[PDB]
């Protein structure tokens with residue numbers, strides 16, 4: 001019964017995604033961040049081909065053809081120590097960052113499974129709000145999950161009561177909350193406001209009107225009597 | 231202010247519970263949301279709504295036992311005091327590596343500069359720089375591995391805030407042994423107590 | 425911001441909302457936004 | 462009671478003072494090592510911004526700041542030592558203290 005509304009909000013939100021990607025600089029902040037992380041990793045790697053590490057230079061040709069061999073062997077040993085520590089540093093931060101990328105990718109596989117291939121009941125796992133369905137986008141060196149979430153918007157206030165005992169039997173909500181606008185008591189699901197009349201279909205009996213505090217009196221109707229009336 | 235976020239988390243959990251982690255805070259009595267958190271573990275709400283004094287007293291006695299074990303047992307905060315100690319030993323090893331010469335004449339800069347002219351002071355200071363620089367890379371890479379541990383436990387603490395404080399986790403033994411009802415953040419130093 | 429200048433203030437942590445808590449107060453959202461996070 | 466770590470102590474190192482405290486030529490040779498402390502400090506700064514991210518992903522799970530009402534009829538659940546006490550200047554709670 002709100003299909004046009006959900007469709008139009010989805011379309012407006014994906015349009016806002018377009019606008020944010022076009023306008024906001026770090027709209028791809030995580031993936032542009034990772035691409036830049038790779039770029040600076042490689043660029044530091046290459047600039048370490050301009051670092052001395054104690055050697056005379058870094059372009060091996062001038063080490064070889066600038067000075068005498070007897071200590072050129074030692075100097076090229078120092079240069080290769082520096083380059084090999086640079087490559088080990090690069091590879092171990094590639095391993096740490098690939099553990100980051102593998103946590104991100106196990107999270108993106110878990111997100112594909114529980115967000116795209118299914119619905120995740122984990123709170124804030126597929127975006128803030130109650131996740132509906134994610135959409136993968138094959139973004140560069142990553143994935144963009146269009147986390148279609150349900151975010152409830154227009155709050156209110158009502159009067160509530162833990163149980164509603166009709167004639168000495170405490171009634172409880174099967175799934176939802178007992179609420180009232182001030183004179184009539186309604187049961188509503190916990191995440192969106194439908195005032196529903198109180199009946200044994202959505203209320204069950206356990207106990208009495210004394211063992212529970214906050215319990216108020218209200219009629220819990222029965223559908224058999226009106227049907228039997230005629 | 232970390233404790234102010236923690237107090238806001240407690241206030242939202244008591245007053246709203248899970249509904250403040252989706253959007254705005256939706257006020258709800260504490261008995262209501264405790265009953266709903268029983269309902270979320272396959273235990274009916276009537277269990278609390280008829281044993282409310284028992285659940286409240288067991289909760290109070292259990293948190294009293296928590297305070298007693300904290301005041302008495304030294305390793306009550308085993309994980310967080312453990313991590314604080316890992317930070318302390320990491321920094322202290324880093325500092326004492328300034329007392330390590332790594333095979334050089336000395337580990338103090340001024341004596342190295344004064345005793346030797348640059349001809350060999352260059353080699354000695356190179357040894358100090360490479361030793362303390364491997365010390366910095368070693369320290370920083372174990373800070374990266376330990377921050378991957380702290381980020382795994384912080385993504386776990388954010389997942390646990392979301393699914394334990396901001397909601398109820400149906401994952402078995404994710405928010406403690408037994409069927410989770412509700413967690414409470416307590417911003418102990420350099421961490422959180424759930 | 426204030427013309428507009430640079431201001432150094434204690435961070436608000438957000439608006440100091442006081443939840444209208446009581447043993448009978450309940451809030452339910454009457455509407456929702458489809459948020460494509 | 463699960464004691465989860467959230468944030469390491471946020472540490473930033475200046476090699477020109479750490480490796481080369483009150484020494485100038487040491488900083489010159491540290492530069493002669495190319496660029497390790499630029500990326501070392503960027504690693505540590507990523508760690509520190511990561512600690513702030515950790516803290517605000519754990520604790521800043523909500524934009525507002527909610528206050529517990531002075532009347533606390535929480536069905537009987539004593540949160541006195543759980544909720545903060547207005548007596549301590551550096552406000553915490555008894556359990557948190």
Ligand SMILES: *[C@@H]1O[C@H](CO)[C@@H](O[C@@H]2O[C@H](CO)[C@@H](O)[C@H](O)[C@H]2NC(C)=O)[C@H](O)[C@H]1NC(C)=O
Pocket residue numbers: 539540541542
């Ligand atoms: C909630 O628990 C606190 C304990 O943390 C209670 O305060 C104690 O109450 C006892 C008995 O009244 C006193 O002997 C202690 O001196 C109190 N200690 C403190 C630190 O206040 C408090 O009364 C409890 N509140 C309720 C409503 O049960």
Ligand SMILES: *[C@@H]1O[C@H](CO)[C@@H](O)[C@H](O)[C@H]1NC(C)=O
Pocket residue numbers: 155156157158444451
């Ligand atoms: C509902 O009414 C109470 C007064 O009983 C008030 O304090 C509260 O702010 C109202 N709800 C909202 C969302 O303002």
Ligand SMILES: *[C@@H]1O[C@H](CO)[C@@H](O)[C@H](O)[C@H]1NC(C)=O
Pocket residue numbers: 181182183184
């Ligand atoms: C509460 O809702 C019922 C159901 O329509 C209505 O009859 C009644 O007038 C409402 N009362 C108030 C105070 O809004």
Ligand SMILES: *[C@@H]1O[C@H](CO)[C@@H](O)[C@H](O)[C@H]1NC(C)=O
Pocket residue numbers: 213214215447448532534
């Ligand atoms: C609810 O609170 C009000 C005021 O705080 C009090 O008068 C009333 O007796 C309480 N009712 C229950 C069931 O706790």
Ligand SMILES: *[C@@H]1O[C@H](CO)[C@@H](O)[C@H](O)[C@H]1NC(C)=O
Pocket residue numbers: 215216217
């Ligand atoms: C509900 O009704 C019973 C008897 O009809 C009475 O004893 C009790 O006080 C009532 N409770 C309320 C909250 O009106």
Ligand SMILES: *[C@@H]1O[C@H](CO)[C@@H](O)[C@H](O)[C@H]1NC(C)=O
Pocket residue numbers: 005009153455456457458
């Ligand atoms: C609910 O929110 C939408 C926008 O998200 C708005 O267009 C609509 O008027 C609101 N109310 C109803 C009853 O849909």
